[PDB]
Amino acid sequence: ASTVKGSVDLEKLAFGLTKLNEDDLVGVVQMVTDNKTPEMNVTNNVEEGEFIIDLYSLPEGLLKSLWDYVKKNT
Amino acid sequence: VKGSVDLEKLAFGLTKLNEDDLVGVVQMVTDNKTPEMNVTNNVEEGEFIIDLYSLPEGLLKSLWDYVKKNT
């Protein structure tokens, strides 16, 4: 149940995030950060180089935009 | 990675800057522009596009230090 929100397969989205080139992965981090709401669980540990996100905390519209971006850039 | 700087970490860190602190990145890059740097400021579109691999190692270190200080 935790793997689909708003008809977006979050596991498929997460698999696709891994295939992005490093400069296109930064674009995902930008899209998440630029659209951040308080309900979104997003942690950017800058010195560690890790960006931690609860995909289920994201609004359906943003998930759809992230999934479209991931399909476009893989 | 170029110099002592992980370019991907630098890029991730740039995303965490507040909008007013991003202006300081644009300032620092523009103030230190060399021909070999690939830097575009599309002013009317509000876009600042840089090849991090094209930046000299000293500027990358000062950028990384700025990012650590302001995030």
Binding site: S2, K5, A14, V29, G49, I52, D54, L55, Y56 | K9
Partner: peptide, 10 residues
């Protein structure tokens, strides 16, 4: 409730 954690690493 429901969660799906992703750790995007450099």
């Amino acid at each position: 409730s429901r969660s799906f954690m992703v750790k995007i690493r450099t």
